Design a protein around this nucleic acid. Structure first.
Length: 115
DNA sequence: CTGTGCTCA
């Protein structure tokens, strides 16, 4: 388990553009992104304004941000979402969930790059 | 130290 996590850690750092997420957010918001991505990231609203499940709200945007052809764990955390389960800081569950979203999202994105 | 999934069924 932990050995395979370190191998994916080097695969995720390889996919990093080296740029801060605040620039990637503008490169996506200027391209009229999908309705869910546009109203949550490209607008001042949040998951509370669309009443979407917080578990899915994080997962839907993490899939699309990584599908942009670039990935890095720090992008998801520096996006500073207001209702994400990765930032509740109430317990260690936020750290275990943060690895789950990046692990499963990259499995799908890598499958779409390896074709 | 303790869960959390995809678009389109």
């Amino acid at each position: 388990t932990v050995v395979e996590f370190e191998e994916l850690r080097k695969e995720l750092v390889k996919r990093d553009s080296g740029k801060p997420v605040e620039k990637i957010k503008e490169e996506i918001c200027t391209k009229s992104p999908p309705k869910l991505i546009k109203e949550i990231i490209c607008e001042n609203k949040t998951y509370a304004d669309v009443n979407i499940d917080r578990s899915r709200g994080d997962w839907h945007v993490i899939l699309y941000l990584m599908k942009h052809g670039v990935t890095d764990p720090d992008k998801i955390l520096e996006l500073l979402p207001r209702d994400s389960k990765a930032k509740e800081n109430e317990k260690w569950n936020t750290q275990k969930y943060f690895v789950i979203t990046l692990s499963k999202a990259w499995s799908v994105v890598k499958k779409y790059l390896e074709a």
